[PDB]
Homo-oligomer: A and B are copies of this chain.
Amino acid sequence: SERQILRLKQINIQLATKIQHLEFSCSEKEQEIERLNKLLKQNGLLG
């Protein structure tokens, strides 16, 4: 049963890193949406 310890530790390190990469991806998409929203507003198309 103990062999699970290393397996879980290593998976959790991989997942903790993947969260940081998806956080950045998500933030980069947010900034693009803001940019697009502003563009639409400047051109009278965001209400």
Q: Which residues of A line the B interface, CB within 8 A? A: 1-2, 4-5, 8-9, 11-12, 15-16, 18-19, 22-23, 25-26, 29-30, 32-33, 36-37, 39-40, 43, 45
Contact = CB atoms under 8 A, between A and B. Distances in A.
Number of copies: 2
Contact of A43 (B12, B22, B30, B45): B45
Contact of A5 (B4, B22, B32, B40): B4
Main secondary structure of the interface of A (DSSP, over half): helix
Nearest to A4: B5
A11 B5 CA distance: 12
Contacts of A23: 22
A8 B16 contact: no
